Every structure is written in C-alpha cells, then in structure tokens.
Amino acid sequence: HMIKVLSPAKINLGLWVLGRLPSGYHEILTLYQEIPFYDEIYIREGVLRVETNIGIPQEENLVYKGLREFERITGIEINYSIFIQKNIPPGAGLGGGSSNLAVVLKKVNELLGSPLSEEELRELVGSISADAPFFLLGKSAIGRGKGEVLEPVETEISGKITLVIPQVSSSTGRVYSSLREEHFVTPEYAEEKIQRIISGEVEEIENVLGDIARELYPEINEVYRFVEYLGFKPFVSGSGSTVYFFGGASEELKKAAKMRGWKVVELEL
Numbered sequence: 001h002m003i004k005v006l007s008p009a010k011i012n013l014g015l016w017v018l019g020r021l022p023s024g025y026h027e028i029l030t031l032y033q034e035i036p037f038y039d040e041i042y043i044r045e046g047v048l049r050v051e052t053n054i055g056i057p058q059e060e061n062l063v064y065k066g067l068r069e070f071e072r073i074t075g076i077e078i079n080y081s082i083f084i085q086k087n088i089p090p091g092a093g094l095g096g097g098s099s100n101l102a103v104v105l106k107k108v109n110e111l112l113g114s115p116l117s118e119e120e121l122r123e124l125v126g127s128i129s130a131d132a133p134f135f136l137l138g139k140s141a142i143g144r145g146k147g148e149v150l151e152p153v154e155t156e157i158s159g160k161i162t163l164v165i166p167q168v169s170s171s172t173g174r175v176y177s178s179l180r181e182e183h184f185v186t187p188e189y190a191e192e193k194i195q196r197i198i199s200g201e202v203e204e205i206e207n208v209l210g211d212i213a214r215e216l217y218p219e220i221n222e223v224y225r226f227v228e229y230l231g232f233k234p235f236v237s238g239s240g241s242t243v244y245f246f247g248g249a250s251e252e253l254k255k256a257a258k259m260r261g262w263k264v265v266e267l268e269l
C-alpha cells in the first residue's frame, strides 16, 4: 500500500519586487523553473504523521499544516503517515517545503475521491505558501501577484545548471523585510526583463533579494565570489541561499564545497 512520490525543486530565473502590500507581503514578478532535483516522499496508510530526515517539527511542517486544513475543509480524516527524505535544504530558496505541500496534497486529494477541485486545492496550498501553486503546474511559469498568479511559458533555456548551496539557512521573511524603496521596480521594467530571459538571454537575470541576502548572510557572498572566480556569472534563487550558474562543476569547486560544507547539484535542462 505504501507509495513513493517525488517532490521537485524550483529556481527563480530572475525576481523583481514591485512594492509592499498592506497584508505584509510583497507584490513581485518572477520566472519559476522546475529543476530535476527531488525530495523522496513516502506515503503509507496509518495514523496522521509528517516526519523528515532533518528534524523539522511536525507542527511547523507545511505538509502537516495543509493536511489539517484539508481535514478541516472536508470533514474527512487523513489516515496517512508521511515521511519526507529532504534532499532540498530548507532556506535554500528552492521551494522544497512548498513543493512538498503541493505534491502531497494533490496526491492525498486524489486518493480520497477528489473532494477538492483544482481551484480549491490551489487555494488551499496557496494560502499556506505563495510558491506552492507553481508546483501544481511544474515546468516554466511566470509568477505574478505574490507568485501564486501563474502563466505557463516556453523558455529557450537548456543545458547545464550547477547549484552551489551553502550550509546557512536564508530567512525569506528577514530578506523581504530589508527591502527599501530603491530596490523596487515598475512592472514594465520587470516584464521586459522576463521576456528576454524567456528567449534565452540568461545574462538578463537579476534578483534584488539575492543582493540583500548576500549582505545579511556573508557566506552567500563567499559562494557568489567563488563562482565568479571559477569564470561564471553567478545568479541567486529565491532569497538565497542557493547560488546557481550555467555550467558544470570542476574538481576545484567540488573540493571547495566538500571543505566548506557546500552542496553541489549538477543538473541538465
């Protein structure tokens, strides 16, 4: 009866902030890209539990929060034991928690005769994480609003991408909170940037949350500077901590990573 579901990561191929919302959130423009980098989620019939291999408490886990809201909305008891093998580190800017939430809930909804429609499911996961609705789509999509208003697109981006992930966990809240008015841009500026990236101009990627994350967490800056030294343009996903570049990992990078406690992920798009 136990089943396995894969939970993919994303990167932001550019992110812009338009301004503050009264709710405390921020209006943004970003290009989401799903990457072949997965948590392994095992689902079995049993008492409701959500466990990970990295000691995330159950009450703080977004999957648990979503399953309980599912129980609440539906009146149906969730009799599933969830174990998540976390390959995607929390605070990496890769949406691992949000992906976990989307994929488990999509799956549990299906297993229970689909009481929630596709709009309702997207509402549920979106109310917990703005990054979660993207993972109900996958592939490539422009995220507008807070990220949850999605437009599927076809990009001309392919080939090698290497993620370099330092041990430090970046707080998405602490970074967003550091945003001054000089960091904001008009949506017209950002919309022009995104279409160039979509057409394959990766040099057009930028992300002000990365700029700020590099100064709040000096180790993100060290990774960034190290990638430059290796001869590549570095880019930052989410609010950090992940730095990515379009190329392969050399032995010198792999050694630096092993010494420094960085995680290196070699992907092909």
Ligand SMILES: Nc1ccn([C@@H]2O[C@H](CO)[C@@H](O)[C@H]2O)c(=O)n1
Residues within 6 Å of the ligand: 024, 025, 026, 027, 028, 130, 145, 146, 147, 172, 173, 176
């Ligand atoms: N579009 C978004 C998305 C996220 N956030 C900030 O990040 C924290 C964790 O998601 C949220 O609590 C919030 O502070 C934001 O300001 N705007």
Ligand SMILES: [Cl-]
Residues within 6 Å of the ligand: 014, 205, 206, 207, 210, 234, 235, 236, 237
């Ligand atoms: Cl960037």
